[PDB]
Amino acid sequence: MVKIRLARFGSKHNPHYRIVVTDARRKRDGKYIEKIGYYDPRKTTPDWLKVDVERARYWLSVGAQPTDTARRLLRQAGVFRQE
Template sequence: MVKLRLRRMGAINQPFYRIVAVDSRKKRDGKYIECIGWYDPKPDPSKIKIDTERALYWLGVGAQPSDTVRSLLRKAGVLQIWHNSKQKKNQKTAEAE
């Protein structure tokens, strides 16, 4: 199963995270399939950059985000887009029947 989770980067006391799509059996900082964004928690407010198109693709093929990544996707607005697209699909199928 593919998961969307954080991969820690940066030096001691200077954490920096990449948001990656990875096989769930791999280690936290092991080999990943694709990097879809990054998260820098140090500045105030923290910085988040997510490739929305790729995040939606991975959610569409069944990737499960970790709790932390889910909250980051929510802050970036990706989960709202995902929810709206699913509602539109459901409405179209209901109208077709």
């Protein structure tokens, strides 16, 4: 199915993923359907994680299945917080 996952973009030893909506079958660094955030695992800057939670919720509402790591990141940015 279509998914919400991480696409790798930094450089060797300098990883920077892009939280992305893509078909599950596409190569990971291939043509995605939409970018909905980004993530720097080494928090090299105060802004190491951004997520368009209004958009995340949209795809989640249409079947997009997040990776366990993508889900972890989306949660951190209050994607599932219903409080």
